[PDB]
Amino acid sequence: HLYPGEVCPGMDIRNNLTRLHELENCSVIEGHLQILLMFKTRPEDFRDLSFPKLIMITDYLLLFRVYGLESLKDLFPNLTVIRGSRLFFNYALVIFEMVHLKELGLYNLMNITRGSVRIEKNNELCYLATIDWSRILDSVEDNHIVLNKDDNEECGDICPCPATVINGQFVERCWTHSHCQKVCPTICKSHGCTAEGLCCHSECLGNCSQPDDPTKCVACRNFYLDGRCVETCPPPYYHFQDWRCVNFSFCQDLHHKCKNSRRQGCHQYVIHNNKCIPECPSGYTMNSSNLLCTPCLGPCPKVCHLLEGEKTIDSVTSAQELRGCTVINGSLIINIRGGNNLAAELEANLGLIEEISGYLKIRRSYALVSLSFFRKLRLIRGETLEIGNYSFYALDNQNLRQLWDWSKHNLTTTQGKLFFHYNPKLCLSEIHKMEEVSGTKGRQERNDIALKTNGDKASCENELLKFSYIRTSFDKILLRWEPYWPPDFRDLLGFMLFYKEAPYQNVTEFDGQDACGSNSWTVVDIDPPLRSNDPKSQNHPGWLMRGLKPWTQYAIFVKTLVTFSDERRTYGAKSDIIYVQTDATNPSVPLDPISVSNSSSQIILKWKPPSDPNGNITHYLVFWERQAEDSELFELDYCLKGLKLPSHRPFEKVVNKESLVISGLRHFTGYRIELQACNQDTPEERCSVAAYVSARTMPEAKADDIVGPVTHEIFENNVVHLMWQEPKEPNGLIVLYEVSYRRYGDEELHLCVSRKHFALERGCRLRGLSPGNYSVRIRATSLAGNGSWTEPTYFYVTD
Template sequence: MLLRLRLICLYLFSMLVTQVRMDEQKLICNTIDIKKTEDFERLHKCNIIVGHISITNVQIPAVITPTDIEEITDYLLVYRVHGLESLRSLFPNLVIIRGKDLLFDKYALIIYENLKLLNLGLVSLLRIQHGDVRIESNPLLCYTHTVNWLHILGNNTKQHYVLKNNKPPSFCAICILVNKKPETEEEAEFQPNCWDFEVPQNKLRNISYNSRECPTKCGFDACTITGNCCSRDCLSDCSTNACSLCANFMIDGKCTDACNPPYYQFNKRLCIGSDDCRSKGMIPFAGICTKNCPKNYQEIKTSNGQRSCTLNCTGNYVVETVEGLETLRDCKTLHGSLTIQLSETKSKIVNHLEEVFMNLKEITGYLKVTHSPQIVSLSFLRNLHSIGGNVLIDNHYALYIVNNIHMENIWSHNQKVAILKGFIYIHLNPRLCFEKILQLKSSLKQEQKITIQHSSPNSNGERIVCGEGVQVLNATVEDFNATAARIKVDIRSVEDMNVLLGYVHYYKEAPVRNVSMYDGRHGCGRDHWNTDVTINRNIRHVIKNLKPYTQYAYFVKTLSIIEFHWQIEAYSKIQYFRTLPSTPGPVGVIFYHSLTTTELVLHWWPPKNPNGVINKYMIYYEKVKEKILGETVKNFTASIKSKPKAPDCICMNLDTENSGAVPNEENFYNKNELTYDEALSNFVYVSRASTGTNKSFCIKKPKNTTEELNEILPVNATQNSTSSKSADINDKMNAKLGTERLLNYSRELELKSLAEQDTGIADYLIMKPLPICNLPFATVQHQLENSCKPQEYYEGFSVAGNYHSYILTGLQPEVTYRVSVRACVEGLRNACGPTSSILAETVSKSLANFFKQLKLY
């Protein structure tokens, strides 16, 4: 027994040493872009690609030798390669695509528009660790649907694949593996997946559900021959702590999820020490073994001759593009000056400004911002506290802000930036109010008066309302549902109505309540704020097309006539609201694996639109009658989803929980349907403001002077009064009459203004779902009489919302089952979404007998 243990230990140690040596002997290459035929030779010199491989617009060589490439750390792109029939001729040994950096930040494998491609042929591919797959517009390509992509993709809830516009599977031959009897233990796993007509799809061994010799605690992970579970960071089989394929990084043959000190990342896949890094002629820095220092770092040599990197933020920096920002990343003190003069109007450069300048606290020279229409505020310099002024513009100015047509604000709220030396020069900023410039006086260390030479009210703020004309606008969310919210503002005065055109509603998704009015704002509109402009004076407005169960930030501003003798503008504070939950969309792709003759492992993707917190999944399964499979599928498909008929009427009470598509779903925006709905509602419902039934506003007819006198004075007094007294009384009565006329006129204007601004809630209804009927299994008549909907009852059993797999047990061998899954959210009575179903078949009886012969059960 002791001898046996020694032999096992010796074997495991030899495996570990062999693994390390084999990895050291592999040829490592950087990114390879193939754009001409001669470039194919570069592939034959590599085993591991640290970067990506892109093969685009090129003719395949007449004679091509298969490569020995086993691993790609980023992505593989094959686009318009002429003459290529199978990737097996290029990458027969490719095992893993790690997806460290993705194409378009999304894709790890892209096969697109290859006219002669017949099959994929990636016969050794086991895992695409990160990123999606897109195989599209290859007209002759077969066997895309016979590959179990969900098995290859490591994270089934986040990674997806698209197979589109390739050769229809019905026009492709069936691979011979479907009816082939298993000859080995691997084939006995019942996997009719193939890469082409005769090549099966290999699978990672840690997903082998037939590894019954592993302890229960290992779950679906593999184990060593001694029964120890493999590490979670191991993608394949293992021996002790050695793994043939690591998920993230490898340290001395062992898998790990990250390179923690004193180790450094090397080639995006290994963790090595600092001495090993330097022995390769590289620099250990910031957890990475790199060839060169980053752009904003300077390479230096220590006293013992070792290379290292030090932060270098010295010089006069000019930022014009996103690329120019990288030289300033990580800078806390900029020893020099900063000029921002943005030339890219179409990019979301403001977001990059906030990211790069997150830590900048001090500029020793000057700050110059000019000709940058994208900038609305300097809030991206939120941590800046001083401008030294050691170097000045024209020997005088430390803060220079000129010709920024959309700038509305300078610093963030409550931010104080001290200008230690020099002065300010701020001109030609038409939306920057002069009052905000005057607030900078307290930041100047040199007590000087801000004169017209430094900043002028005539060259700043002339295109916006400033000063006393800016008022506070009170806005509140009056009502909301899952996809809409009604915003209400205060009534404006009659004087304000002379220049008021309407309102602008700003809103954006805000998971955290830390939004500022100027955060992320882009002068050319390329930011995350959505705007609704209403050219009417109604105090109510409904924001539509919102996402269910999502928190939003919003504020409102008035839209006024600027070129007018009476200027008024008003802003509301930023406030928040969360939309109501709604029934979720259907679950994503459902797939299964035959575990035993009586068990199926069911997997599914969560809904694309959860519309709330998924608290459970309802699973239901039943046997399909033993008919011809084609007929069964046909009938089953028809029963699952039938195309709804056109409605005979328009239901005015919209049920938001079952109201169809949400903004992210296809066919949501139907212009013709929206136009029809709007026209119909305008025809049926006539606004009270436009009818002739409005209350008329009348001015009481004034009495003449004689009538007034008769009411005030006795008859005798009137007859005996002198002409002078009559004249005095007439003057008083005329003054009183004029005052009453003025009051009546003002009252009439106020009533008209109120009627124009507030037409009532009826014009801005927020539809709410019908309540649940109190009567169980309510009849249609009961529903109509009580304006309610019945309680839904769901068949099957529930699985917690944080699980996306389940093992169905107690099934019968060689039987087809109809399995249905639906998602349910918290907070609703009828909480479950539509059903998604598949047909799943247990292992055949002949295969069960084969398992018994192998004594696997």
């Protein structure tokens, strides 16, 4: 048979030898086998227990900290292959920290699928270099066998097999003193083999019974099916654990087995691509009866079944497990008994939920003010009810002033009853709005939600406020609204002006951020206005804002204020929030204008957009200047030590880019470059200060050397005079002429003619010239460097 035994789930063994007895009949093991951490175990109870039927290993096998073993071959006589379906601690097979292990005994290993072997901290093992991992491990670059007994060549290493020469040495490879590592001809690399060199069927491995048969060898490569295995079985069966394929009726049962939330190590197995895979990946969702994965058109809920049917949420961790959940098949209860700052984290943890079936209850919430973090809520089933058929419950909460924004929020209630008691910080009109937007309209308990204990302490207002005039400037805004007086003008404390900038318009209403939290609405107060007893007067109260960032939208509103007393009147008034943007002004300076020269007429400059554009800048303004040379260098004796070597004004309206190149200019000339970032131009033309950089273009190759008639005049005193022409456009400037002469058989003797010397003499001279035939050559050395040499002018002076 290929596999006549039984499947065998991965076990864990520790502190005893009692629970290894379950290995009596299983032959192939799925998962991993792990035995570890046993101390009070004598070595003698090991010579009687064994398991001959074990061959296949899926993930890994590990033994660690064992006291009593000396050669495990008596325990594992027949295992041959490990699939390595899950790598263990980036390793495939490891033995570590052994005490009595005399020898390994793993003589049946044929081919390691994936991963590496590691042997460490074992001072009792030998024959470690006689394994030939390369013939079993397809990868050797990951092996790690250091600090063992074979650290010193001291353990024998004698064994009676081909003794391969894989390295530069004739090395003998044996497992034990009674066994070597079997190697047959390599005509087939991993197609299985026999002891006579005959390769068995192509699609199986290792030990074999009859060649060229996929029905009677031991282990085959791809899959397995009832004594046979083909590379891809037909779709009466669907692949499983990448070593089998089976009918859907088998693994439809496993999904049902632990659909009961009893053991969280399983998987609700799903069919996809002929695989009964644990989970179909993202962008795919489960179907009800077909057990396939639907392409998940758009976002798909990833339903999140609640345990126990009910749950309470009190801290970050209590809700952290709900992150990503969208639909709840139970009931939820919230109670933040105190807490510092959770309003900034609920959206990051639960602000993506939409559907729930149970009932929602809020109680004893201390620092809660709104329900905005419940973002995508639309419907509650209310399938289960609180005692008294209550679907929504609110009780004993001392800061709740709002629930939702019905201008852009929708919520539906299937059934149940609401409970609003001891909630003194929320007005009755808001819960009337709750009822109107909800499904219930007249389902009142009588006594229904409390109408007297809720909102009594909070003076909910019913009066609006409107502006009178708005003013704009670059930094300062002015406000002044229509004046107000309470029924008792004596009873009045003034107004508060809450504000903050906003790049959008999805700004929250006053959420009453009173406990710990993020940036609230920074605010100043205003003195109450002076009574005038006049219909027409300056009773319109205003206030100034000064420190503003220009060109920025800003949202503001004003709120009244009054004392608290026995009478339930003078609730004050509240304006409405609007949006107003500030004006723009001069922009900031551009950033890092980088100019680079490549050719003698090409100069490119690139910069960065200004840090503060202050509105949509229209274009960039550019300017340059052709710099001049140093006039003081004209009068330097350069043959003395010390020489130098360097490296309106028209404009354009450069638009819609970040760099510009300029051509048609002088060669090897310095240039001062300035550029202004600038906002909208034709009205109030205002630009920033120009960023100033300097740049010099490349020189011209021929500009340094001069060609022309080099004539000579001979004087009576053997002082020959020399006439020639200077470069018209030197690279920067000519600084010296490398004048020199050569008689035949004599080296290049060079003299100097400085700039001023050449200017005054219109040439040079050679005092004290020996009679002979001399060749005079000149190199026009400009400041850009040495030029080329002239023609060596021949002239012979006789005795």
